[PDB]
Design an enzyme around this catalytic site. Structure first.
Site, PDB file in Angstrom:
ATOM      1  N   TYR A 125      42.232  33.857  44.236  1.00 22.76           N
ATOM      2  CA  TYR A 125      40.799  34.016  42.996  1.00 22.76           C
ATOM      3  C   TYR A 125      40.545  31.911  42.673  1.00 22.76           C
ATOM      4  O   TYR A 125      40.004  31.805  41.362  1.00 22.76           O
ATOM      5  CB  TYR A 125      41.622  34.055  41.584  1.00 22.76           C
ATOM      6  CG  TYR A 125      41.559  35.796  42.353  1.00 22.76           C
ATOM      7  CD1 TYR A 125      40.410  36.675  42.000  1.00 22.76           C
ATOM      8  CD2 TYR A 125      42.750  36.966  43.128  1.00 22.76           C
ATOM      9  CE1 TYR A 125      40.325  37.914  42.058  1.00 22.76           C
ATOM     10  CE2 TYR A 125      42.437  38.081  43.196  1.00 22.76           C
ATOM     11  CZ  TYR A 125      41.204  39.145  42.694  1.00 22.76           C
ATOM     12  OH  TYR A 125      41.156  40.019  43.037  1.00 22.76           O
ATOM     13  N   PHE A 396      49.771  44.189  35.890  1.00 18.83           N
ATOM     14  CA  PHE A 396      48.940  44.622  35.703  1.00 18.83           C
ATOM     15  C   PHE A 396      48.047  44.701  36.879  1.00 18.83           C
ATOM     16  O   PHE A 396      47.623  43.595  37.285  1.00 18.83           O
ATOM     17  CB  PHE A 396      48.529  44.224  33.763  1.00 18.83           C
ATOM     18  CG  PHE A 396      47.973  43.652  34.139  1.00 18.83           C
ATOM     19  CD1 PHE A 396      46.371  43.642  34.246  1.00 18.83           C
ATOM     20  CD2 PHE A 396      48.465  41.920  33.023  1.00 18.83           C
ATOM     21  CE1 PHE A 396      45.940  41.577  34.352  1.00 18.83           C
ATOM     22  CE2 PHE A 396      48.168  40.854  32.858  1.00 18.83           C
ATOM     23  CZ  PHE A 396      46.422  40.912  33.739  1.00 18.83           C
TER      24      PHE A 396
END
Lengths: 396, 396, 396, 396, 396
Positions: A125, A396
């Site tokens: 990322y 999450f």
């Protein structure tokens, strides 16, 4: 051949399948349909293979609407990426770039100053502008030897069934997440999910218990694999008193040899004990990753350390704008400029600094962050630090 | 029955025996006689069992004359405790208290502002006023996956036989130890010891090699137990360039799967790589422990952060004096007073703060450090921090 | 900057250092100076960093003069690459390509039809035209359960001190290597090396023993790590009788639980026992790698299976020439042509087929080997097979 | 005392109990009642202890009606032994001999040329004339490093829910089993069983997924014990293209570190990759065992290699008849004779040769197979080999 | 603050919660409600935190009414302590002392001569007068090698479904527990509990089987973790014949490599085998602990060895009375006295001697047991021994 678009309800089953094949933890879809309520209209993208009626999904990604606490107890709308997945059949075809680019435009246009994620791997990322922003720290305490220090605070804690004290847990977590950078608002639907997991599952996890204090709680479970290990899945303490009292109770689990917890690097637990080693660091890893979407909005939104005196500089973020950055009195002003840059960094580096989990001087030593003077570095390093250490909320 | 006194040369063999039985690493005594040169006249205490001609040693302790670098590049005379041992036959009889009390009087009277040690266990020395002051951080890098980041600096490094480049190692270490808190002067006799270990020993360790750069070096060895693991026993880098170049060379050891090193928590290595996880924290532990002998001498000797504005407070150390503490312009003035205390802590806590490895606010959260206002805490926390992260030199 | 050249005697110490840092097994250099006698004048290349007097070595490679047995009991001059190494400081700079290219020209010009090596890793040498040509097969026998089959042959074997029966070992090995593809001539200097290793080393390996038969021998040792494991370092049997008698003796080591050996896939041992499972395959790996230097010389030199009827085809080796290949009566004729190719493969594939360890049809299934008809495939597959299964001689 | 007879329906519960106590995998009986449909009337034998009404079962055995593919794509009626079990209370009393003798008479009289089994242990069935005839080969691929070779074929594969593509799986398997020696017809009832296992079981196995190609499929699952391991339970590929495409998809499971599969020794997977080692052989074992019931029927039924020229010999199988064996043009004629034998072997050896998984020359080296001339050996070895490598279908 | 009292039915849920948090094995409460029937009115104590309506339980303890067999086949009413637990929040506050003191008064006043328990840890109960009185001995047999000795007794054993032979198990256990010191009466409610566990649980334990003999049985199960290990959960044999026949059956489990059982130190199994080592002691631990409540009642109740001649002495138990102890003809008379003590011991030591599992001379060597003469020691040591070795019944 491949098309990128917002999923239909006809795309769901494809998405569930891809999800199941990509995330071991996935099942159940029923839980997937809890998190779905956190997904805004247009917060989802899928890639279909070909064209026609119901062509198969081969890529998916989405974001959830979240509230993240940043230093100075400021709460930001945050777009939380999750369920990002590419079919094993379509790996090096640019699906992740396309899906992330599309999602970021939507996130930017919607007005989020910040985006966030938990990374399945550590090398994906950065290229998209996300930097590791919190640090997970596992401590395993050998409670057989643990004695509390004469100074340690402390009765007040009760052993409790989680499912019977939801209101107390909610209120405590809510106070917790408002005071701690890294804190996330936990919506009712996530409390349903979390509360449900508490019951023992045959072949799965044992039943959970809770230790409840007026100002904090801990949720824990015996490990399935090892029966002398107690796993603390969550400990939220709003005062130091609560933190210590909870740990006196946990160290009180005489049936156990070891207590483990995923915590933050500044957890004061080691210092509660007469032997600081007993609180052993067994694991470390990046927690929450941040992408600063809007640099000036984000830099102006957070509080800065009051100790550092007022200073001004020019910050350039690679392909992210150049700004005159003025920090004084715990507050920042961040305006457009074309004056020469005094500091430069990629976008992801900025997200890593943002909650104070990484020092500018450490980033600079690795040359990620190029600067003019050491003085500016020491100032950027003092200003960006956080009074309250940064912690991680639910994944999450 | 038991008598406490300075050893004679007739006490040596007893001391060597006790040493051998107490420290696995001990043998050889010949090395013991290198460190002996670091022991000042009267830096040694033994406990004899009974009275007569050559009664047996059952307790021993000593200190070495050392030079420790503290923040602001200030070098302090430091008394380094080592070879502290009580016979397994005389365990709970107060020998350690008596020997430490006697040694501390001598150390105080001799004018050391500070004493230091490496702890064999984590629960012994707090009671004597020593606090953990540096942190050892093991990183294991899976070099099979490691790629350097586009930003990373960088040829300049040579693969070299340690024994043929002593002068270069000495000069580099010397520059290193003067710039880094935690740095220790390494005397010629310790370079003899360290240089000797470089040769392979049958049944023992494999031969060591070195990577040499004009501004740093690394000493490493293949592990005896595992042959795909390279152990970096020592890496001293004076510039960031040198640090990166050395790591490019180490990651270049294609014959290996993993490189490990004992380093400090702010080692920038993780940030040199495209995947920060590869640099995995496998172990953490207290390094050097400090006892502040003379509070005002020590507080006045070190530099403080320039960022924090001038402030004044009253510091009380339990059974260690009360002081008016004034910090401004990176400098402290520390004078006697009887005004009411604004902050209180045991002596060991102070040693833990002293090199900046622990934050006052973390100590306060554990209640070790009691203070009046949060503001004072944030200031004590900013002032005591270190521009240059604290590192650990050789164990002793 | 970098220069490629034949080492001087002044380059040796640099080479020894690089070697020591690249190969764990290396030390001793004294052994290095045994293998050196196998290196022809001009069989060595080094890369020096810079220019001047004695600039440091950063790359080295060499080949040894060897004799390899190929199917049909034909012995080929073979250039054996070894001690190939690049400094960890100069990794992606093309040193290995340059050194291999230079070595191959020398090898070609000197008239070797074939080159060979043992690979430290499996992904390096295909790019240079080497293909895995033999297969190492570890069998671990649980001798506690092992009973020989009523049919098994069989006293004739003696337990013997290796160092006292060199002449018998030499003669047996010599007969062995002439009959088995993969066989290498073992020169006197290598018998000195091998014989020496037989004595126990403190901290190292236990002493070796031998089982001697008029027609075979086994050299073995108890494992250092595990004391119920006997390691057979070498077993050379010239007749089936000798092979069985040796195994009856090994299974006779009642002090042991397990016997292991590195052998070949067609080792008949499993079939000597009433339970074929006891002979368990614990490990498999490529052994000797081959680069065919001169295609027609090599294809014409080896024998082919007599069973397949005469056939003709056109073989193209990528960047290696096109040939009219005629095989009949166990013999091949291989002439230049420009007729259309019926079969194509990279050079390395050819080396993999050459000793019969891999079937053409398996290579074809992986598309490495492209062919016109299945019939040609079945013929190439029958012709290239070996009456006597291919084995591996000593690593180099 | 003990009686041997065909079970009644009143014997079932006894049989289920014995089964449950003998086979861990057993439960459920409900599945037992699927396989029962494969058992011909009179394909079952039980041993009862004593006489009377419902005396307890202490021994059981049966065979199933199967179709086995042998070289030349010829399909033979095959009697598959399974659920063979003796009570732990009646171990050395000859029950297994009696039950096997009785079953073999029935199998012979019914006209099966061949019988087969999967062995729970490797030392039981040779005495009954069964020889290991296929070889299981476990490959574990570290997919983190795996790159496909430039030559490798190749989108076409879909990630799919097994339960929704039964028809496609059936058709593919059916094509597969007709082309590959070792192939078994998989009846509808076994597709019900196999399809059912696909769903996740709590405390048991995770849910399975499939990779589907027009010409092949793979069924896989994450391991319960290890979550970075994907287990390929079944991969049936009819073309090389399908085989490669399936493996590109599997190597695409980025969530995983390792993929394992039970395959055959000639699986071309290692050759698809740039580093053949990544495809590591972790386990090897006998798969299907064969007993040749009728020698001439079986020898005449299979195809033989076309490459070997016509030859004639005399084969004697110990207590199994002597035959004039004539092989030419891929076809064999096998007639009774009393001419002197040129080759001799026990029955089990013949079953081991029959599908080409073992070479006659290897059996001969172990002396199981005694022959007149080496030439005959090389011919028996070429003739019996299989164009298409032998594979293993489902265990039974 | 804290109050100690008999639980109400309103206290149950609190007690179940505490139980669940204290004992991993706990769940299910439904089973808790089986054992409850063994708890006499007033056999339970709880500690409540505070006062009011339903204040929370923080401590609990109870005893069950049991019948224990002691040497001479004498059966004593015995109070069995269990479900003893203190909340992790109230650890060092004297709750265990208070609860045990209260329970012991009730037990004494109710007329139990003896109390008993199984200890969760070995350092808790000595302070309360309980001594380890039986010894658990794990034997693991490698049944692959196990052959029975020519002398060994021995068909008679049947493989059986536990749930279908309850009556036979009950009768056998009942005979067993009446003949063996350590034997406990097993009430109908405990047979319900035990019988239920026999069925396989998904994610939990596999199904159990039984080996039944007219004079003994064994209950066993394959291990969940290891599938080549059979666990014998219970083996009750009333004759030596039954014991041997059961072991011949267990060694008959050819599907297994190892059989383990928790047994007693005098288990004759090792002597049934030709190699006594195969029966390997893998674990040892204290089983049942005894507190002698009433010294003279208990000493007079048990039988003593007939071999030792009549002797008299004076026994003093620390804070437990002084007694004139006369032992002859296997019988003891135990009367109050104030004559000088010849032997002294704490109460717990007496419980350790009581069933003969520990020799007085061994206790004396550790100085727990102080005596006048060695002769008295040898007599106390012979008299207290047990003809029938002491065994352990079900844990509680």
């Amino acid at each position: 051949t491949v098309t990128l678009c917002s999923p239909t309800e006809d795309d769901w089953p494809g998405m569930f399948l891809l999800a199941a094949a990509s995330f071991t933890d996935f099942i159940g879809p029923e839980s997937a349909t809890a998190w779905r309520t956190l997904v805004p209209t247009d917060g989802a993208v899928v890639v279909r293979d070909g064209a026609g009626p119901g062509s198969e999904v081969v890529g998916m990604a989405l974001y959830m609407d979240l509230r993240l606490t940043v230093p100075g107890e400021v709460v930001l709308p945050t777009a939380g990426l999750s369920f990002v997945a590419v079919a094993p059949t379509h790996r090096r075809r640019g699906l992740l770039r396309a899906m992330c680019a599309e999602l970021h435009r939507r996130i930017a246009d919607s007005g989020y100053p910040v985006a966030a994620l938990h990374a399945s791997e550590g090398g994906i990322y950065g290229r998209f502008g996300y930097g590791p922003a919190t640090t997970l720290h596992e401590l395993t305490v050998d409670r057989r030897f643990a004695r509390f220090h004469a100074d340690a605070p402390g009765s007040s804690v009760r052993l409790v069934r989680p499912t019977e004290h939801r209101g107390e847990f909610e209120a405590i977590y809510e106070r917790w997440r408002q005071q701690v950078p890294g804190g996330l608002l936990r919506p009712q639907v996530l409390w349903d999910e979390l509360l449900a997991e508490c019951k023992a599952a045959p072949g799965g996890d044992r039943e959970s218990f809770a230790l409840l204090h007026p100002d904090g709680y801990a949720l824990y479970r015996v490990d399935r694999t090892d029966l002398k290990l107690a796993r603390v899945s969550e400990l939220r303490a709003v005062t130091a008193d609560a933190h210590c009292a909870l740990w006196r109770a946990l160290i009180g689990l005489d049936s156990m040899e070891r207590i483990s917890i995923i915590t933050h690097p500044q957890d004061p637990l080691p210092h509660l004990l007469t032997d600081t080693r007993l609180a052993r660091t067994t694991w470390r890893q990046d927690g929450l990753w941040l992408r600063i979407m809007n640099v000036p909005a984000a830099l102006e939104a957070r509080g800065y350390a009051h100790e550092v005196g007022e200073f001004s500089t020019v910050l350039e973020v690679s392909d992210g704008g150049r700004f005159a950055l003025k920090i004084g009195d715990g507050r920042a002003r961040c305006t457009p400029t074309d004056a020469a840059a005094e500091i430069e960094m990629d976008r992801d580096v900025l997200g890593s600094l943002y909650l104070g989990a990484h020092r500018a001087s450490t980033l600079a030593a690795a040359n990620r962050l190029r600067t003019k003077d050491s003085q500016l570095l020491r100032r950027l390093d003092a200003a960006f630090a956080s009074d309250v250490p940064v912690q991680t909320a639910f994944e999450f």
